[model samples]
Target: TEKFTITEHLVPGSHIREYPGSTVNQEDVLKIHVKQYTPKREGPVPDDAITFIATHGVGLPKELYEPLWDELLDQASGFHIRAIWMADVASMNQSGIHNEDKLSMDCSWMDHARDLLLMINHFRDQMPRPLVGIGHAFGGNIITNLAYLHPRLFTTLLLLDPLIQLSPPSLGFGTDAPSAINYTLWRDDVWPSREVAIRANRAIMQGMDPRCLDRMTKHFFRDLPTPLYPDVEAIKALFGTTADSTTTPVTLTTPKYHELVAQIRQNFNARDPKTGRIEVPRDTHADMDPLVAYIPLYRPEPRSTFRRLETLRPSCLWVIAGATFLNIDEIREGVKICGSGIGGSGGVPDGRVREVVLPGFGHLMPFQEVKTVAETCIVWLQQEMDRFRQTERQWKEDRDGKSHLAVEENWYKVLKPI
Candidate 1:
């Protein structure tokens, strides 16, 4: 692949610009592929401006989001929503290894996050405007990292049951627990083809930790009344066979794994580094060492940074399906962590992070409840943007000392946690 490549997948409706990083550069240049959408309007651009940079979960390509983009363009009335599809570390790794590149493309979760920030910053510099991040599943984690890292860059964040912390820590890398049975299935049982992988994935899903399975299923299918379920076969096809898959593995030595384990355990029990008041994961040398040196250096600080962003009292609006394994309580807890301070000094009030729960919906929000999701998102965006603009105006007025508006009092009352 060259330094960058832009291709027009849709000429009339939207354009897909594909970027590839340079092979020879010592430091990997972030690769960003964007799908730009323009509303069909005759006059100057509307003042209520908003843009969406869409990202996908692990092993998913930009093409997967094409349907969602189509829906957004058709449904969004006053906003300029563009889905910027960037290649994730996992996908890049798969592609890089197949091309026989000298540098390994495997990226830790944080590494992928940094690349996302670089792309977002690049876009912001090029087009100065208020932006919102809309991400689903693993992509949600990516957006959260970005929002936490650069809160000033985004006005609001819409996450679709994001995959932040993996359940049963044993499932993640550097654990002594049994290597995922699925890993073996992918490597040996399903080798040489994705059909086998699909069957294996289905089996694993059936046996998955209830929390993980429910969350994924609801996000994909249950939230709305959609007849279709996640296409197991399609997912399988994307991954292909373990032998054919191009991603290189991050070789972690025994000592490195031990060090990472110790850090994670310590962090799990420590206090928040920034606030000092909130109880959170520790930021000791053990926690920082593995991520900074041993892990793939894609997005270095997302996990930690996101923890800090959780302190920001950003209001949230969640559209969820009631049937999934993702217990509503956990989701609420996560919001409390991230959205706490929005309403007041103590924390975000009860109503700040509103949940629009659909009784029969599934994981795929867009396809399952297309209209509901679209309408809810538009309303939330409009409301949040309006509030943010008003706050900005008040700040300016107060700074100028021209008007003695009771802005702080109003903010204290309105933004106080419920």
Candidate 2:
């Protein structure tokens, strides 16, 4: 089999392979990329022996997680870890369904779940071992949904600020404030060329943190002649062209901008009838398709199984965001907040999910405090793995009639709850 080579790290240990998609044709189905990292020297696998399947956030490709992967690899010295890039789901169907009636029988989540299982099966075929699925943003949602469907596949799950729940029907496009603003900006031809887009993105980023924005702009887009400015063609090639003008001085019609805003509002405002909830749609191919094409495809629906989550197994870990949770607490307390709990607690243990606030730090705590998070994860994973192994051993003994055990009892209750 021919292998696609990714030459990021000079080290020869890392390897890349692509898995073909099931439904879509060879040209259409997304390419599933896997990056496997093996330890340098063969030795007894430690108790913490684990593989990390890191998934990207919404609208981001596998490359976006490259930095995070590198950081994790540096810290995961004794453990066998590999990062699998989930790419089977078509970018076209990321958002809600606009034409719900046309594809009412569609099982979109099932497709994504199958993709994840396929990846896990592929990894098992190649390197049979237990894996800890780690995901960020939309990737977290994918992992959570998959775990809910097939809990036996993964040993542990790490979700980073996941977005769950589905929104309303008419809210498919720009029905919300943020969505309206972003849609208006995107459709207005406000950014003519790649450089303008980069600059605009940079400006928005700068609003987040001016110092970091300056450093990132220079570090990532330094190939440009100017330090602050990026090459227009390069930026366009990176992100792709839009409906507006292709050059730097592009402008959008007022009505077009308003339509874009409306679309965004509809997209964000759509609610699920069954659950009466709202979820942020994955922002992958939003800019690629037409507004009409999106309308029928992106209508929101109540998630199929919040009920299943009530009986599902529970696992807990301290998630340190490296920033004060004061804002998050406030948001959770806000009236507009939907669903049962903040950050999709309906599925997992809401009480067990402890958020540790770190002073004088931002969102990238895992990177900023790599050693701390890595050590904490290693220790917690060790305990969890040991407990799971012991339980399995006891279950086997009980199955052999050597011990009396209640088969119908919830395993989560036997293990540490919180």
Candidate 3:
């Protein structure tokens, strides 16, 4: 019933923040489809209250996460969120100012990263500093991009199943980035009926958290309708149910459906923009693609190089699922190139970045594992925060009597670790 709109955003940037399609320079504003969850505070927002900006991956709405967020709150004590903001990226649910059609296939991750930047800045004024950025899969990379270029915008980053792969000789971080077309080209966006879509979604949700899989049940189809034949129920009202099809439709398991959908999707024709109609009965799936194709950086560009920072910034904490999707040696190399802070070669004087891996949990650990993962995140966060604040407070007390302007000048580097 409600429609979403984006007022402003960073350039990916371009004309939206500047002139439509222009890439000369950039500015800031807002991005949207935001859903906020605020915990009832006893008094003022506590200094320890965790402030979070959570985002989801492609082809899904924010509703699917109600369970995860609610459980996260329920499982809280020392680690509780003061507020959490979750948003849907363009091309999936809320396109906002982003004109998908106009977006070129070459549109890279930077564009989405710019959206995250604009979003953080938009809420930065009202929200406190050193915020945690949460994202899964594609959403994770987008957040990482922002943290890389502008680490000041983040206290830490929680990337669930982010698409970080191994880089090749020429370029790349981990598993070379795949094209949007790779999946969409052979994937059915819609189905013949709502029931069919649900069955199809379940068919594909093999290893997903059982409940979250059900939660994802609806995201498979777009929030639109398709034509349907008169069913037995509807027909019975008119003609006593004499001539009707079977009660249930045939379904596919996720594995089998993958091969089947691929063949069909590849052969399916592109639909008309004017009318949402398709000739192939199998082509009933919704079109979940952004109007444009996606392209990413040549080599994890915009990544942070922590070595450059002399003063303290938001100490970084990265909570990952089991082993990192991005391997250690390569990730360390990436750290050497992109950053030198906690995990990289430079190793900061103040021990700025800290990372820990939880074994057993898979990529979508936060979802499949739900409450357990939430608790782990909080537990680590609490310890990390205590360590972070200890150092920060000590630094302030240690230099309280220094020249006012001098302290400001020297420590400004900590603002973004520039």
Estimate TM-scores for all models.
0.56, 0.52, 0.61
Top candidate on lDDT is 3
Please tell me which model should have the higher TM-score, number 2 or number 3.
Answer: 3
* Model 2 segments more than 4 A misplaced: 1-28, 42-48, 76-89, 92-110, 127-129, 165-176, 179-198, 203-308, 314-376, 396-418
lDDT of 2 by residue, 1-418 (tens): 0122232221111011122221223233333334454444445645435656655443333443444454455655444453334342322111111111121111233345555676666556443446677665445556666766665556666655433334322332465333423444444233444365466654334333233343333322222222122355544454465343434422221123222322232333334558755433445323212333334334221233322333323243424354522233432222122223433333223332333334565434433454555555655566556766777789777777533555445666787766
Best prediction by TM-score: 3
lDDT of 3: 0.49
As a TM-score, model 2 comes out at 0.52
Worst 10 residues of 3 by lDDT: 290-299
Which tens-of-lDDT digit does each residue in 281-370 have in candidate 3?
Answer: 233222213221121222232122222322213444445666544443544333233334343323333354445566776655666677
Give the winner by lDDT: 1 or 3.
Answer: 3
Sort order, lDDT high to low: 3, 1, 2
Question: Cα deviation in Å at residue 220, candidate 3?
Answer: 3.7
RMSD value for candidate 1: 13.0
